[model samples]
Target: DQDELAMLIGTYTNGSSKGIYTFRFNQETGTAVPLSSAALPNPSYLVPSEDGEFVYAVSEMNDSTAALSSLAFDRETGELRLLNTVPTFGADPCYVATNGREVLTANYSGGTMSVFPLQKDGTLAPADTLFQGSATGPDAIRQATPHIHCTVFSPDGKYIFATDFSADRILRFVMHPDNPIPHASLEAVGIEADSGPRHLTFSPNGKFAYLITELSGKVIAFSYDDGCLEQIQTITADTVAARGSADIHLSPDGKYLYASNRLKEDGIAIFAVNPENGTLAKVGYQPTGIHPRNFNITPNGKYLLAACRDSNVIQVYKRNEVTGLLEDTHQDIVVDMPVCVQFVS
Candidate 1:
């Protein structure tokens, strides 16, 4: 029973998927069974609360009607109940993150970030602060304007980062509980032109962070101290042209790193971590189903579930703890257009 947990899959409703689907995953057996689903339009990204009692998702859309919705999650039953929804004000909100105190959304088409305060019953209030991005990159088609892809909080909850895809920058913000706005702008991290930084993940110890670029298909490693990030390394996830690198995550044990690549040679890149210096070396790559947008490692570090959007199947893999390689169990959680994965105990 301890080895079994709840998995939440966010998807695009333009296909067979209704909204967010839940599954019961058994780490010991390397299998997952579909349980329940909540209906919503384009729930493409999700973030569960720290307490695991609530989940938040972004209704990705192209107009100003883009919104964030909160849900009450029952882990035992694998059911989700809609709480309430609020307009993000920004268009195409692609990512949502929370630090328990408030929620933040990265609006891609709108090129902005919106902050929403939480209510007593976990519902969200209207956004009180909105941060607009003006930075642009070298590519004229995709970099003519800012495209905010993902927002992540520091492990200590003192800082927040927003990845600006078209801007070639990671915008930083300082968090303060007593501050009227709660978040304040800080110095931005400059990335390579036309790289299009997308998702970012921090190490378990909070000493290091890694980022994946959508346009260049590369990973940028950084050393973290307070609210400042210093670039430490830049590694490749794809040797060919820009292939749309999607997600990045570190193993729960902090011994390895993984990133998903799409558009060509669809797979997850494996890397061995150097804990002492916060560096990495490529170990291997596991070819996955098409369009592995978001893949997650189980808390126990025994399984990896990849949301293969185009294939309409979530491929589950057994993790080799010693070798940092993945062996596909051929077990799949079939769903349509799965774009994000979350786990709860």
Candidate 2:
């Protein structure tokens, strides 16, 4: 049972989080205990390497320029040692993702996304490409500037997609298998105005894709072929007060889809995935803390954990493997304004 298992938490240092924290997670009791952690601006997002040897995060700092930092992670001990940092050339970088030696960050206020190389020594290099686009949606106020919330890659890592919140578009790009400095190319796939695409994930089989919109609280379905996304259907999650929706992902088995609601509603919208076409049918909802901004299902699909920012708690739920329904486990990890919950899978 001692196989390396850890949880990396990201939070706003200005609040409860001093910085990014590491915890030793026990699958047996569905609990995580704090281990080693570090304080960095607003480490709102953290991405661990495939082998769990390193951790990368965004400063999300509102200073002159935001930045990205990395650390040497001890997979077995849950110890994180700072490696180095690099300026993101943007502001308020909220999300980060990595693929092998490549790292990407989504900046919220900067209106741009930047790419950096992952060094062998666990540090981040200067930006190789700082992607900037000029397009705004019709949200009037929220769409005043281009805001990209997340970056996702195809299962094969051959394609990259950027979800622009303020622009209301899911921009596409394909990876050139045999390319050098820049290996990605901009492509297509369109969503309606104010769709406010925030995050995306492909079906386990890779034939279909799903998108979660933040401003509209909608989950859209699409048929995907390589780097192209063909819009298929769209459904909205219930909003009690505010339409601020957040994270999205699929169950490990690929049978269920889940998205978080925020601003007004603090809960998760569960959907039954139609394996035939990758469309979703709402099943039920599980209420959580004040803002269920980010959550993750255990790799085994046995439990779901929701990290609440406004509520300052991580709530755990028991997952019904057969039905994909989330029931309260009544277990919670108290932290200062938690925003992201990631398990070392």
Candidate 3:
């Protein structure tokens, strides 16, 4: 059977877009053609099931209520049919992730995170567990109250990591598949005050990791241990301003690390990775449209897709294999409030 590769684009439907879009992507040639799209409110972030049998997206709400929706995904037809929607038990949910067995969402305004079973029929069970924290940090506005930013499963899948944007914590929660209630384990206590951990990615080897700080505009490097990380290096993804550092991902080849920054310097920060130690050296930078919130590198590591939310564009870049740098591919997918890019096969 020939596997179809697709690029899933999610957007905030405040503009002209309806909701999520499915597009056929050619990795070898770096081309994309839209197959289908749906209309959903504030579908800002998306992640597919481990088996690629389903896709989960979040409706980024503003108040104390939000939703996470599951859709049945057909690769051949590139059609997404809504399976069900569930309350996230929190407000303004912005991130959703799963590890085949369970799904989790981190709510921004609600300051809580909820976990739901990854049901067999591509539907979301009720939120089984909820975690809340309201610790405040130094920043008066962004950090006055706890803002849960992101949650991801550990590389080994034994644990889940949750980041509190306002509290400056990346917490480790032990995944107790058989237990009645799973509890958070103190692993890496958290980042420093106002580090504003927005997103995280593991090195290909799982021995290293990098975190993009939203307020500082820096990539914090760490050595990965057993469900914990030891801070090692911090380098400015943006050498200029320290705000709008949004997302980061290690190339599939693990040779490069990239992060995005918004505002006046709407661009991507590229870094060359050290294979042995996992530290990074700033190599080159690529200017994007604006508000590059989320992006992903193709499995082949030949192309990079960036979602510029403010500009309503998704830009493609051809990766220079040798230098781990990026260049405009002259291909841009125009949409409304495009916020995230993920590829599934």
Candidate 4:
């Protein structure tokens, strides 16, 4: 099972940083062998195409308007070749994802979202649609205006969900082949006045959705049915102290829920799913060292890589499948402002 596994790591370029590093992962031992590096700017988020032929990244920078870049990947050698880049419509694009044929980007500064068509040659076409909305949430400085934090398609690929942190609402839209502008028939769900809805994830079964609100520092569970979302419960991200929530992810088996808190008091929070009602119960917490901006679980669900942004390190942890707890592996990989982690095999 581990023979074909390869790791493609994305990093930030400091001024004239040279290349993006790639690694050969050994799943059984939780070790990685550095392979080669590709030259690129500050790549904050990465997602491979459904066909595994191309990879997409969001250039996180202020000087250059937020843009999405496509690259061709060599699965065998972990090499990347720049294909082309396209504007994200909004400035300071932070995250990007692809559904094989098209790419979507979340512009943090411009307070908008854009969709671009992916060409056959692994390049990005001009944006076909742009969605803009008002931003008004808890953080007066950051959430002063509508900052589209992320755009994601449902597991079944029927609907698109956009999290508006500054707007404090989760907007739902239908994906029509003919119409590129999603949210043309928008159905918005308003959270707590100042919740600051950020990144959201759905359960494997697609029966439920979970959102990590940055301002409220809590997780909101929703029952998703035919593109409509119904609030089920809102749970505190940290029981002891108040901290902002960053990322939220559900286990492959849909039995556990994991969320990251950016405060020093509680770094990572774990919750066990109440399978019957799809609710979450706080199980435990772990120290992620510092400001965990984003993290991803291994494909096999055996380990997790937490990107500690402020500390400039990536910490590996062993996952207890039964207990839903994280144990430090004592392995620290140093890097600068590691925001997102993606695994390819």
Q: Relative to the unseen true structure, what is the Cα RMSD of model 4?
A: 1.9
Assess each prediction's global lDDT (C-alpha) against the native. Answer: 0.89, 0.81, 0.84, 0.79
What order do you get sorting by TM-score, best first?
A: 1, 3, 2, 4
In terms of lDDT, which candidate is strongest?
1
Poorest 10 consecutive residues by lDDT, candidate 4: 15-24
RMSD of 3: 1.6
Report the poorest 10 consecutive residues by lDDT, candidate 1. 178-187
Which residue pairs come into collision in candidate 2? 16-336
TM-score of each: 0.98, 0.95, 0.96, 0.94
lDDT of 2 at 104: 86
For model 4, residues 291-335, the per-residue Cα lDDT tens digits are 888888887788787888777777888888999899888777676
lDDT of candidate 3 over 110-140, digit per residue (tens): 8888898867676889888888866667888
Candidate 3 or 4, higher lDDT? 3
Runs in model 4 lying further than 4 Å from the true structure: 1-4, 15-19, 178-183, 240-243
TM-score of 2: 0.95
Best by TM-score: 1
The residue-by-residue lDDT of candidate 2 on 1-345, one tens digit each, is 552369988998886568877887766568777788887888899989888888898999766558999888886778888888899888888889888768888888887778887776868888778777445688777788878788777776787788877767776666666541344465556678877888888887888888888777899999888677888889887556266888888888889999999877579999998888877888899888998889988777878889998888888888897888988778888889888888885
lDDT of 1 by residue, 1-345 (tens): 899889999999998779999988897897887889999999999899989999999999999679999999999899999999999999999999988779999999989989998888888989898898865688788778878888888898788898988888889988887652455565689988878999989999999999999888898999998988999999998776545789999999999999999888899999999979999999999999999999999999999999999999889899999999999999888898988999998
Residue 60, model 4: lDDT of: 73
